Amino acid sequence: MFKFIGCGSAFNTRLGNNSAYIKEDGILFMIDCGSANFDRIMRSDLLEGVEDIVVLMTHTHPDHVGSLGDLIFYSYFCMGQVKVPNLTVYAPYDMKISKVLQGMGVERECYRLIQFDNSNEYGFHIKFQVVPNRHVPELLCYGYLITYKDKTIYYSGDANNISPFILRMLEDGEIDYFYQDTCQADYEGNVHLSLKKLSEMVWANRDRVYCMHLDGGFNREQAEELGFNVVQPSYKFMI
């Protein structure tokens, strides 16, 4: 169901920062807004015809929150009714997203913030359920089970593992689209899931698995040979 504003790892900025979106009925829904991505959005026509923006947060690394404040300010000052919020951030309460934004001078008057512990929701309807994922110990990091147009989508966020319960859902056909942070590098303490490990953990329904957050060394040919899909920025974001 998802298209991508960006799909690279933090240093692979030619693909943009990893961020998926849905645009429908004047609503722009996106997961994360990394440092590189506000400029990509502004150079595209993605915001044309958009009445309301919704941003769902996975964690606050710079390649996931670094330009959210730019987008908040732009939507507040320049979109629709000037100086009225038209962007809603959704985040787990424990992430303390407002404190991160306030550190950059982004105050609550500029956006709407909906926080939750377990789940929440936003003709456009979307639901999401938190899946805490391990990534770095410095930050609380999340993926999500997302329900949209009667499809079930798993979106890992940045993650170096997959819960056995989520794997079982995928194996049993209960996840229609499975977006997974995957990297080529394979090493102890990896903060991302290697392609090798992904191939060891998923045998069934590989055709529903989409590798994202791709590092510069990522071997797309090998990923496809194994039966996985590899995401790329949407054609809107490619020359």
Single-letter residue type at 34: G
Which of 80, 94, 104, 172 binds its own copies (CB under 8 A)? It is 104
Contact with its own copies (CB under 8 A): which of 30, 52, 53, 59? 59
CB of 65 to its own copies, least distance (A): 6
When asked if residue 40 is in the footprint of Zn ion (CB under 5 A), the reply is no
- In the complex with Zn ion, which residue's Cβ is closer, 52 or 70? 70
Give the binding range for its own copies (CB under 8 A) out of 58-66, 125-133, 144-152, 165-173.
58-66
The residues facing 154 across adjacent strands are 145, 178
**Residue 139 DSSP one-character state:** S
Please report how close the Cβ of residue 150 comes to Zn ion at its closest, in angstroms: 30
* Helices and strands counted in the chain (H then E): 7, 14
14 is a contact residue toward its own copies (CB under 8 A): yes
The two most distant CA atoms of the chain are separated, in Å, by 51
Rounded CA gap, 86 and 223, in Å?
39
Supply 91's token pair: 């985040």
Min separation Cβ 155 and its own copies, Å: 19
Check residue 189 for interaction with its own copies (CB under 8 A).
Answer: no
Interaction partner, residue 188 (Zn ion, its own copies, none; CB < 5-8 Å by kind)? none
Instruction: Select 12 or 234, whichever has its Cβ closest to Zn ion.
Output: 12
CA atoms 4, 132, 159, 180: torsion sign: negative
The answer to whether 18 touches 8, Cβ cutoff 8 Å, is yes
Tokens of 36: 């590189």
Nearest one of 27, 100, 35, 87 to 18, comparing CA atoms: 35
x-or-dash string of contact with its own copies, 114-153, rule CB under 8 A = ----------------------x-xx--------------
CA distance 160 to 192: 4
Q: Which does 184 bind (CB under 5 to 8 A by kind): its own copies, Zn ion, none?
A: none
Does 92 bind its own copies (CB under 8 A)? Our answer is no
Q: CB 14 → Zn ion: shortest distance, Å? A: 15
When asked if residue 192 is in the footprint of Zn ion (CB under 5 A), the reply is no
Alpha helices in the chain, H assignment, sequence order:
37-43, 62-65, 68-78, 97-103, 164-171, 195-201, 220-226
Q: Summarize as ranges the residues that interact with its own copies (CB under 8 A).
A: 10-11, 13-14, 35-36, 38-39, 42-43, 59-63, 65-70, 73-74, 77-78, 99-100, 102-107, 136, 138-139
